[PDB]
Nucleic acid binder design. Sequence first.
RNA 1: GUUAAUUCCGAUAACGAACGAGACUCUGGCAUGCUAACUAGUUACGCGACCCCGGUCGGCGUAACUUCUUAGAGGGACAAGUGGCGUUCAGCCACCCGAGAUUGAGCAAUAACAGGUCUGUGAUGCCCUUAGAUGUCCGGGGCUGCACGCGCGCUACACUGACUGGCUCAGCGUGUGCCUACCCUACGCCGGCAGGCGCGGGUAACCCGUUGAACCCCAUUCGUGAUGGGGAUCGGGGAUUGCAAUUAUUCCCCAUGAACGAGGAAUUCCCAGUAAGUGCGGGUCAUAAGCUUGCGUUGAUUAAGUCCCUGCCCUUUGUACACA
Lengths: 66, 100, 144, 55, 141, 142, 185, 75
Amino acid sequence: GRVRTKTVKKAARVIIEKYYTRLGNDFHTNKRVCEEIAIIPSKKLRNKIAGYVTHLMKRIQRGPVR
Amino acid sequence: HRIRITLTSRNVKSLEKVCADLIRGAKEKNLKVKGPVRMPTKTLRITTRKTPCGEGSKTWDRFQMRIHKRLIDLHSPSEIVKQITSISIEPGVEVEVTIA
Amino acid sequence: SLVIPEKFQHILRVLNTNIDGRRKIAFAITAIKGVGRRYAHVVLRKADIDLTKRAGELTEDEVERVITIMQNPRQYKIPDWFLNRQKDVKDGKYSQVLANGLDNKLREDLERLKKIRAHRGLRHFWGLRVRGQHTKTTGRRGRT
Amino acid sequence: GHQQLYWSHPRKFGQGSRSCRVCSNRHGLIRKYGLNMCRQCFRQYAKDIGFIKLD
Amino acid sequence: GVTVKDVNQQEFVRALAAFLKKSGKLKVPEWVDTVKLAKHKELAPYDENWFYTRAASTARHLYLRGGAGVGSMTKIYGGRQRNGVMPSHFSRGSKSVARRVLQALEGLKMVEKDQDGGRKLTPQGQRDLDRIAGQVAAAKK
Amino acid sequence: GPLQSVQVFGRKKTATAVAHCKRGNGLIKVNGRPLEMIEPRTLQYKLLEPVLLLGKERFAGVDIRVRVKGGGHVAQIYAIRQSISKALVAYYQKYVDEASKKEIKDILIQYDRTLLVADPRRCESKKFGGPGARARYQKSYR
Amino acid sequence: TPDIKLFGKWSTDDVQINDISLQDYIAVKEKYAKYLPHSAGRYAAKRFRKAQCPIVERLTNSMMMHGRNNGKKLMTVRIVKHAFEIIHLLTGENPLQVLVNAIINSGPREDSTRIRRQAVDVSPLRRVNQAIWLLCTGAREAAFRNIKTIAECLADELINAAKGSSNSYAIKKKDELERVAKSNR
Amino acid sequence: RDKLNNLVLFDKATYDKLCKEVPNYKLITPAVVSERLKIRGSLARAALQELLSKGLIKLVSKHRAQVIYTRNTKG
RNA sequence: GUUAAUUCCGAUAACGAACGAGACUCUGGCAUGCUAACUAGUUACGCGACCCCGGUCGGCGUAACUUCUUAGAGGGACAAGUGGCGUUCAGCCACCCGAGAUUGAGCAAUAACAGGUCUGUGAUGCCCUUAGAUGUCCGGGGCUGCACGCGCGCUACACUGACUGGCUCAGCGUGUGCCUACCCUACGCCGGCAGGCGCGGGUAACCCGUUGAACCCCAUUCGUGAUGGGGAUCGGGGAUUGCAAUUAUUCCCCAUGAACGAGGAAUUCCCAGUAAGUGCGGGUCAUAAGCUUGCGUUGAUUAAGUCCCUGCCCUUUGUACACA
């Protein structure tokens, strides 16, 4: 059971909405980008947010996101 | 001249700040100083009952008190050691100064 | 050497108790009351006896010697910590007692406790536990 | 005498010579590390002493 | 040559027991053939010369590590205390038997008492132990 | 000349065995004694696995001395079994070419993961209300 | 021997798996054979990872039962090794081949279950499991309160199961389960 | 209900049978020897030690629990 | 639809939200990279001892270092990548690379229990006693009592075992007390043993202690006999703690040697370092673990599903129940 929650998902949507140019495709790049732009108090939550950012960027490269 | 400082503390980052301040003080006062040696920590374990009486499911607590100890050697006279240890003390860290 | 020899006895008569010669010596002595495994090993070690032999190849003068050694523990160099009657009440003699005087001294100690009417003798006469056990939960198959 | 029999009991041992240092009762004493106090008051004042439930 | 670590210890202790049978001057106590080796054992040993084999074991333990007094000997010869109807535990060996082993190996020179307690092993004993190790090696070759 | 000291550890649950490789002759010993006398003696082939899988030529030039602490019998046997293989892999990585190191690593991975990768399985803690980590005491209804 | 693996003194090859249904579930050929069946673990973490465990290690792990023997794997490796020695000194063939033939001739092809019970066929891995359990139960029943040792009893059970003379307890329970399944169908 | 009447030492007929038929058995092991000759297992192990001292059987693998002996070689 | 989850996707008279879960802290392996080490070791030497240049030495000391030891900042894993299923969203399975691709504990929402505790309190309300006391102390007994039944545990019913020697491996830990009168023990003698006597070390990575623990490994004795399994009961004796052991406080020696041949209906716990075997620490302790809580060794079978039984959670239906 690996399902993300709303505190990960809405924060990741705000990060991609405000910083779409700084974010990219590579996980180990945009993980550090999200670390520098957002104050996340824990590495586990930071990795969850970065993984959902990578998955939304895959959705953007596949097509439009609602 | 070989004066020994023992740092015993319950909290972690406060003890780290105290020993880092002692390292910076020894480096600014420019004496022959050894590295801070970490003695292994001690976890005081207490296992008692949650219930005051003995009526209910058998539950047990795990009270853990983690104590830590470090040591720093100094090659300096006693006045330098007292001048360093009399500045920037906090209640989390107990300091023991041994002359010999 | 390991075949059945002559004069092979199946039932030995040593201290009014039958001994099966099918068993080894150091454990067929133990069928006699008052002597067990440790005291049997001590007697067969203090006497010049190879204990690998069975209980039917050993001779009659040799078992008379074994009887004399078992009846006289002091004179054949056996210390005073294998004896079941250290510091006896009546004679005060350190000795090992064999298969009839064991029960005789046991019932004489019970008769002494009965004669003095102690709590130990009262619990023996009542048939209960006497070493301080607990009869609430245990001791059911002996009493109905 | 009354002074000779009011304190004629040896209190050098046992669970009645020692007691709690809050309740002064003779049950559930935590004699470990010189606490010398009952487990209910230990649960009450473990936060003030320094014992915390980490794991 | 070789040391005792190149030698199988199970036949090596029997070889040094045979060496003590060949020598025969250890001044054994009178109460050897009637004593139980520990408080937790049950029977007397099946072998009549267990004292020489245990002296061999004492020699190789003191060769491997020194400073082993009576408490360390009771620790290495401790085992299961089978209490009967109660669960079994660990118990130490008997003090006096290993003490007589040390008194024999001090009466004839194979060990020597050391400072701050303990028994070390003398170079004469090391000579004899490595020569019998070479004997067991030449036997197994 | 240059000392080719290679110090490689291998970890069981408690058993940590450190193998030490250098330049020398074909001798392998653990705590001073060789592999021929390590009790239990049924796991002699389990200690001779890297020798039989890699030949005597690959071990003829490397001497191995292992210090051992922690664990049990099987734990220390598997700890030294992992440590001598990882020390040989690190020696062939550092001082000779990487191709033979890669081939020997491929042989070890095709044989068993225990030779290189340590097991992360450790003893789970006993809980209150049970005699073990998962078992519970026997509940009595009425 | 860097080319071929010698299981003790026994070769990996010359193993003729007759049943095509068990060629994936009997892992004895060329990949999972070792020197000794003793190992560390991890084979029972995943569902179908149990099939990749070798059958000699599975017999080794299934032999240790009944409280007092749970946790003596070196000791039951000694048992299995001496039992293989007795199997070779009686039959004269490969004891691994004798054990594979025992699994094939002792594994029941049908069983009864509850959906009044109905007869259904079993999985091949389940059949290997049932065959190992029945032969281990027969060996332990033959060695319980007997002069004949556990290695001799396990050797006699595997040889009687490979022969199929209806003398092994595993063969008898296989015939009993086959009769019950033929009855309630 | 049943009691094993096993012999403790050798009879003449049993000793001749152990000298005749036992070195012709494929399994020469003390449990099978005791079962087929109605003797003790310890007496069977002593008979195996006597046959090892005589030189009629061949050891395979000895152990503290079970010893394994077989026949002489064919060639 | 999906998930361990009111966890999300998406429709939608809903929108904005809040507690719980999730998130959080600690524990465990991954680091040959950083910080450090004479209260821990490694490698090279100076020696000394032994065997025939080489090997060993926890026997000594030192020129570097943290790989083994310890604890701090950290980093590392997130469904990250590929191939399938699926509104192509939420998500699921397998696999390469990889130490982990589901470790465990704590905390844990609203509301309720006529649950337990007045025998934890100098937390406390009401009632009772209060001098021949229900206050307090002393001496003894009892809380252990025994035709019976129930519950949690320990030992076995054996040859996969018992006994005897040899060998060989840990970490949680604890250790000299306000009153407090009571610590852990190295080593040498006396004794079989419990133990006794002397000087030492330790307020603890210094000393116990390299914590030489068991099962397990090897070699004899046993031979299917309630037998060398088992140790219930009982007699005689010797010591330790305490003012006091009698109702044997506990430990040791000898001897007596019962049931028990795998246990009926019924019932408990569990699926990976798990169950189970096995031993070691703390609390109870002056003397003490057949209990409990932690830790270590060996270490599996079977399953990756289900509402069949027992219960729980959403939707609908029926109710003459609402101490339901």
